[PDB]
C-alpha cells in the first residue's frame with residue numbers, strides 16, 4: 533500500500549504569507565511545474581502503480597511538487613526556508629532511491645539546477 537500523502541494544511545501550524553513565499557509560488561514553482569521534466573514530480577510517488585514495493589521502505593520523508601504547490605496555496609509555511617527544504621527533500625529522495633545516471637535522476641538534476649537559478653533572485657523580506 534501507499535502511505536498517506538504529506539499534509540498540505542494543519543490547524544495547529546501557524547500560517548504566513550511573505551514576499552519570498554509569494555515569489556516561490558509565482559515564479560519558482562511555476563517555472564519548475566511547466567518544465568518538460570516536471571511530470572514525475574507533480575504528485576506523490578504512487579509506488580503501487582509504478583511497481584516500486586520498496587520505495588517507502590527507503591524513502592521516509594517523501595515530497596513532491598504537488599504537495600509543495602498546495603502548501604504554498606494554503607499559506608502552510610511560516611517562511612521560505614521551510615519551502616526550500618521541501619524542494620531539497622524532493623531532489624534528495626530521487627538521488628537516494630535511484631541509480632546515478634538513471635533518466636529520473638537526470639531529470640531531477642535539471643530541475644534542481646533551474647530551481648537554484650530561480651531562487652538566486654529571491655527578493656529580500658519586505
Ligand SMILES: COc1ccc(-c2cn(C)c(=O)c3cc(C(=O)NC4CCS(=O)(=O)CC4)sc23)cc1OC
Nearest residue numbers: 571572573577578582625626629630631632634636
Ligand atoms: C506518472 O508516471 C510516473 C510518476 C512518477 C515516476 C517516478 C518519480 N520519482 C520521483 C521517482 O523517483 C521514480 C523512480 C522510478 C523508478 O522506476 N525507479 C526504478 C528504476 C530505475 S533504478 O533502477 O535507478 C531505481 C528503481 S519511477 C519514479 C515515474 C513515472 O513514470 C515513469
Ligand SMILES: [Ca+2]
Nearest residue numbers: 634635636637
Ligand atoms: Ca527510465
